[PDB]
Amino acid sequence: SALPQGNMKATATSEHPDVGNEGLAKFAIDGKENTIWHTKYNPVEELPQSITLELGGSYEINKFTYLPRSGAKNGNITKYELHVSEDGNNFRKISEGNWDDSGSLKTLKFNSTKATHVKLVALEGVGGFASAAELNVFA
Ligand SMILES: OC[C@H]1O[C@@H](O)[C@H](O)[C@@H](O)[C@H]1O
Ligand SMILES: [Ca+2]
Ligand code: NA
Ligand code: NA
């Protein structure tokens, strides 16, 4: 089941300031589909950029979901890696691939692994931005 988002802390390598529904990292874990993390723009901080969720404990995780922004496409992530850490500093890759640029929920299912942190790396995204409406981590 999804770990409680209110026990997590989101940080990112790049985040746009709060201009309403974007683009602070914490907007990716607020349970609100209208608010999004978005990489910093004006000017762009180029991809790759990433968002890390500190989980609020060390959990055996097996699924991750990425919900894109709704009603528009800038930052819809189309090439990704998923990494995990048990110390907040040293990361290891557990998933990688391509996603379509539609607003559909994107789900990753993987070998059970122990993590205190999960990092979603946007290698490519629509417009060269990365964005995320909601991220969930399942244990
Ligand atoms: O310049 C980048 C910006 O483009 C806007 O059109 C969009 O609504 C923002 O979310 C951001 O992607
Ligand atoms: Ca949100
Ligand atoms: Na343990
Ligand atoms: Na394997």
Residue numbers in the entry: 1355 to 1493
Give passages from the manuscript.
CpGH89 (EC 3.2.1.50, CPF_0859), also referred to as AgnC, is a family 89 α-N-acetyl-d-glucosaminidase that has been shown to specifically release terminal α-linked GlcNAc from the disaccharide GlcNAc-α-1,4-Gal and demonstrated to liberate GlcNAc from crude class III porcine gastric mucin. Overall, the enzyme comprises a glycoside hydrolase family 89 (GH89) catalytic module, four FIVAR (found in various molecular architectures) modules, an unknown module, a C-terminal fibronectin type III-like (FN3-like) module, and six putative carbohydrate-binding modules (CBMs). CBMs are presently classified into over 60 amino acid sequenced based families; the CBMs from CpGH89 all belong to CBM family 32, which is one of the most diverse CBM families.
The 1.55 Å resolution structure of the CBM binding galactose revealed the β-sandwich fold with structural metal ion, in this case modeled as a Ca2+, which is common to the family. The site accommodating this carbohydrate is a shallow cleft marked by two solvent exposed aromatic side chains, F1483 and Y1395, which is present in the loops at the edges of the β-sandwich. A series of hydrogen bonds involve the side chains of four amino acids in the carbohydrate-binding site. With the exception of E1376, which makes hydrogen bonds with the C3 hydroxyl group of galactose, all of the interactions are highly conserved with other known galactose binding CBMs. Indeed, the interactions made by the five residues H1392, Y1395, R1423, N1428, and F1483 make up the canonical galactose-binding motif in the family 32 CBMs. The CBM displayed little to no preference for either galactose or GalNAc and did not appear to significantly favor common disaccharide motifs that terminate in galactose or GalNAc over the monosaccharides. Though CpGH89 has at least one functional CBM its specificity (i.e. galactose and GalNAc) is clearly mismatched with the specificity of the catalytic module.
